[PDB]
Amino acid sequence: TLLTAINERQFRNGAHVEKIPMRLLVAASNELPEADSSLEALYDRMLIRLWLDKVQDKANFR
Amino acid sequence: HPHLLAERISRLSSSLEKGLYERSHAIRLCLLAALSGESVFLLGPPGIAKSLIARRLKFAFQNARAFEYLMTRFSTPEEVFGPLSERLTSGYLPEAEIVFLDEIWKAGPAILNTLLTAINERQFRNGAHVEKIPMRLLVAASNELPEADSSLEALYDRMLIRLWLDKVQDKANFRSMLTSQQDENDNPVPDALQVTDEEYERWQKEIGEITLPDHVFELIFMLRQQLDKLPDAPYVSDRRWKKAIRLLQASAFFSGRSAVAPVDLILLKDCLWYDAQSLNLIQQQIDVLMTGHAWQQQGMLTRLGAIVQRHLQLQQQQSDKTALTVIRLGGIFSRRQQYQLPVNVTASTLTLLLQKPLKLHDMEVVHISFERSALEQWLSKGGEIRGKLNGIGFAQKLNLEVDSAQHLVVRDVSLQGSTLALPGSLPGEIKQQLEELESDWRKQHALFSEQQKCLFIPGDWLGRIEASLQDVGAQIRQAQQ
Numbered sequence A: 001t002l003l004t005a006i007n008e009r010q011f012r013n014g015a016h017v018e019k020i021p022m023r024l025l026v027a028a029s030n031e032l033p034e035a036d037s038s039l040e041a042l043y044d045r046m047l048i049r050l051w052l053d054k055v056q057d058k059a060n061f062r
Numbered sequence B: 001h002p003h004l005l006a007e008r009i010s011r012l013s014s015s016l017e018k019g020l021y022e023r024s025h026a027i028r029l030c031l032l033a034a035l036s037g038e039s040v041f042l043l044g045p046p047g048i049a050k051s052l053i054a055r056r057l058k059f060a061f062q063n064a065r066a067f068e069y070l071m072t073r074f075s076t077p078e079e080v081f082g083p084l085s086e087r088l089t090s091g092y093l094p095e096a097e098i099v100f101l102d103e104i105w106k107a108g109p110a111i112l113n114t115l116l117t118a119i120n121e122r123q124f125r126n127g128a129h130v131e132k133i134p135m136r137l138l139v140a141a142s143n144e145l146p147e148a149d150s151s152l153e154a155l156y157d158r159m160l161i162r163l164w165l166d167k168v169q170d171k172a173n174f175r176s177m178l179t180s181q182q183d184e185n186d187n188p189v190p191d192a193l194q195v196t197d198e199e200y201e202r203w204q205k206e207i208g209e210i211t212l213p214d215h216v217f218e219l220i221f222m223l224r225q226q227l228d229k230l231p232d233a234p235y236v237s238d239r240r241w242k243k244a245i246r247l248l249q250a251s252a253f254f255s256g257r258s259a260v261a262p263v264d265l266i267l268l269k270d271c272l273w274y275d276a277q278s279l280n281l282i283q284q285q286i287d288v289l290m291t292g293h294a295w296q297q298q299g300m301l302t303r304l305g306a307i308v309q310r311h312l313q314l315q316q317q318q319s320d321k322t323a324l325t326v327i328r329l330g331g332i333f334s335r336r337q338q339y340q341l342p343v344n345v346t347a348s349t350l351t352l353l354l355q356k357p358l359k360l361h362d363m364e365v366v367h368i369s370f371e372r373s374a375l376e377q378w379l380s381k382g383g384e385i386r387g388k389l390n391g392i393g394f395a396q397k398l399n400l401e402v403d404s405a406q407h408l409v410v411r412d413v414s415l416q417g418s419t420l421a422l423p424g425s426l427p428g429e430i431k432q433q434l435e436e437l438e439s440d441w442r443k444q445h446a447l448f449s450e451q452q453k454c455l456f457i458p459g460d461w462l463g464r465i466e467a468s469l470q471d472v473g474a475q476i477r478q479a480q481q
Helices: B005-017 B024-034 B109-120 B171-178 B197-206 B214-229 B238-253 B262-270 B279-290 B301-315 B372-378 B428-448 B462-476
Strands: A010-012 A017-019 B039-041 B068-070 B098-102 B137-140 B349-354 B368-371 B386-389 B392-397 B399-402 B408-411
Touching (some): B005 B024, B024 B039, B024 B238, B368 B372
Parallel strands (some): B068 B098
Antiparallel strands (some): A010 A017, B349 B368, B368 B386
């Protein structure tokens, strides 16, 4: 269901579909998926892949 | 008198089209079902004007009443037919003609039960004694589809016409639709095109008197058995076949005809499907049937083969006159290839005759056909050739080699020679039998060139019927060259 709400911004509702006024789609996790699995169909469609990490600087931590 | 009826109907449907764009197919089907006593179903999203067509067909009559009710999940039968005091049915449905019911897939159980008796018997359980219901047109639109296992499928299986409406797609038709100054509540139908109550009662009796030709029955029985063998084809009940005849007989009645025309089977594309999956299957089987056995398209193909089989029998007897000389070439290959005849032959599945017959594969043969894509491949690279016998069966392997005199010698299990030959560019017996089959194509083409003015037939279907008739005629004129 998450693959049809990105390319066409639609979602089925029993019979027909309807538009979704979605403006921003964000997703976070921790681990990485497998190399041969069905979860790679959603990762290959996202654009920005942010790489966040914990703080390291001491001045910005005070 | 019957010829002037088609002109009055063509002018009546033209006035109803003014005000709605890309909806000509929906108005024509609702007009024919109203004059014959049938129903019609619509489907589409809210906003494509689905309730306006119900209030538009009421102006084509003189004594017609409208009824637009919105069925909800808490609707009661007393608020539809009339509240009892014996039921105050003053202007509702038992005495109305054209009624409209929106969102019919959500009413109560008592509402659907009363609608089943008002269609088969045209009556209502108005207290003790019953009364007839002068219902002329039954239309109902919605949005979603019913379940696969529910009681709502009882009414859906009884309806005949299943219209598939959708939003506009053309850009030029959307510009003039928003700025349209034509009113949708006036009376655009002239007073001279409106039928009276006496003409309606007389037309309902003359529809059932339309004769059923023997050639038309062969298309209905064949389409019924074809859908039963296909597991993916939707099931068609016996009630749908009986109610479809009343629609086809009414189409030829208002078109200047007295019998059932084979072209009227095109309207069956919207009376057999039930969902979006079976929509592409019904239109595919009818397109093949209308271009195969309607005007005897394939019927003359199986009859022409008997003439060709007899024609090839007389040509192989005198094959000693016209031989088959193979010339060389100068392409890009090392082994000595063999070049066939250039512009003299251009067919893909040509046949090759022979002088002395041989017993190949424990059976006799009089002509061997080689594919143009397969004969040129063996003569180029080499290896083994594969060819069928008598134009039937699979491409079996033969012992064909090259002759010293530039010919084609076919070898068998006894090492016997047989030089092949091609038929040259007409006996009296073949010409007498060919003109009888060719005259049948002109008789079937003359019928199509007289009934094509049917307004109820869509225009996109005429582009494929004419292209199918010219393909059969172009093949029968090749053997007579």
